[PDB]
């Protein structure tokens, strides 16, 4: 059966650079039935050009696909930080495939994060267990690392991260550290910090409260 | 105006069964064939089978062949995804989509998850996070997903990150819904995050204020 082999599965381009993503039939596909489709996070694919080469209702100029024999592009001309999701080709053949998908992100200028800690909530101590969160707020790049710190000692594997979606219009990232002590526990200790190390700081940034 | 509405999602232990339904509306039912996508967590696109609604006949992929079954309800604009015998492998986001065209998905519905695991449903505890500008709500210990979090019934969207649920060691999934706002309104304006988990038929709202 016909597969679609995609490339690159991901990118990361500024805002205005050109982007070419390829899909590879394994023979031969129809111009007419080879379509691309444009996924957001959180959302149903949507149709972004149909028969190699013609725009979906209401999709933008700087979209356009071609092909080459067994093989078929899609260009993005001039990126927009709203291009941000993964590109998906699809075939017709009897049967149906998908390419396994490029993301596209989008390189933007360094960007440092606004640091936040909230303590446990009074009814959520009274459940027995003790939630400290740590916020770290619209940065660029991706990369960050977070440090917890209870009475100044330094914790491990009591903690879970989660990180946002880049932004469709800042093309920034948000992040979630969580760090979970029994009710027990939390009264047993006084200072609860957590350290951020980013590119866009010049020195480590401590945020912190106590108990 | 076309629009494809998916239901019939949730929770099936490994080895059950589960119907998915795609009801269809703004188009004359029997001009399109009506087909299922699905999509596993952090994967790609599935093509899984499709019915006519005119012929009456469905077609599969190889891999669904035989464990799947498609049918239509032509009177009331819906086709069914019949699903037996689920394993793990099978938990996914699924998607329906109409044919229009040379062979391409024009409209798709929302996407519904269905979960396949051992485990029961459990409804989440939603504690404050409380600024002091940053707030939000932690929303603790469910299972399934998904969960959706509004901040005002919908008025406050702007600067909020909800971010991607963790799963925590106990199998259980948590999530944190954050929002800026402006450093000087806190006496002011009222907020509150509204939380909706329908696998456990729970709606929370929870005021969240300084302490």
């Known amino acids: 059966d016909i597969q679609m082999t995609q490339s690159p599965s991901s990118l990361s381009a500024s805002v205005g650079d050109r982007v070419t993503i390829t899909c590879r039939a394994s023979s031969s596909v129809s111009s007419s039935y080879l379509h691309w489709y444009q996924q957001k996070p959180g959302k149903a694919p949507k149709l972004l050009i149909y028969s190699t080469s013609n725009l979906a209702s209401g999709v933008p100029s700087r979209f356009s696909g071609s092909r080459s024999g067994t093989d078929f592009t899609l260009t993005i001309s001039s990126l927009q930080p709203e291009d941000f999701a993964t590109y998906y080709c699809?075939?017709?053949?009897?049967?149906?495939?998908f390419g396994q998908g490029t993301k596209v992100e989008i390189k933007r200028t360094v960007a440092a994060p606004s640091v936040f800690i909230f303590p446990p909530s009074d009814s959520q101590l009274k459940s027995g267990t003790a939630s400290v969160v740590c916020l770290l707020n619209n940065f660029y790049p991706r990369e960050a690392k977070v440090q917890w710190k209870v009475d100044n000692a330094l914790q491990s594997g009591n903690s879970q991260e989660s990180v946002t979606e880049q932004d469709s219009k800042d093309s920034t990232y948000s992040l979630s550290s969580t760090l979970t002590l029994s009710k027990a526990d939390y009264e047993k200790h006084k200072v609860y910090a957590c350290e951020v190390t980013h590119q866009g700081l010049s020195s480590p940034v401590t945020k912190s409260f106590n108990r | 105006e076309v629009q494809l509405v998916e239901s019939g999602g949730g929770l099936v232990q490994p080895g059950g069964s589960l119907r998915l339904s795609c009801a269809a509306s703004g188009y004359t039912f029997t001009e399109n064939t009506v087909h299922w996508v699905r999509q596993a967590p952090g994967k790609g696109l599935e093509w899984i089978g499709g019915?006519?609604?005119?012929?009456?006949?469905?077609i599969f992929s190889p891999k669904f062949k035989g464990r799947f079954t498609i049918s239509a309800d032509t009177s009331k604009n819906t086709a069914y995804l019949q699903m037996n015998s689920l394993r793990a492998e099978d938990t996914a986001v699924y998607y329906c989509?109409?044919?229009?065209?040379?062979?391409?998905?024009?409209?798709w519905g929302q996407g519904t998850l269905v979960t396949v695991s051992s485990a029961s449903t459990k409804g989440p505890s939603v504690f404050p996070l409380a600024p002091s500008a940053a707030l939000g709500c932690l929303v603790k210990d469910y299972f399934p997903e998904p969960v959706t979090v509004s901040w005002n019934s919908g008025a406050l969207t702007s600067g909020v990150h909800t971010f991607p649920a963790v799963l925590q060691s106990s199998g259980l999934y948590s999530l944190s819904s954050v929002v800026t706002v402006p450093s000087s309104s806190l006496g002011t304006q009222t907020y509150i995050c509204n939380v909706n988990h329908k696998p456990s038929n729970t709606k929370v709202d929870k005021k969240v204020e300084p302490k």
């Open positions: 699809q075939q017709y053949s009897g049967y149906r495939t």
């Open positions: 019915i006519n609604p005119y012929y009456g006949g469905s």
């Open positions: 989509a109409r044919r229009a065209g040379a062979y391409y998905f024009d409209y």
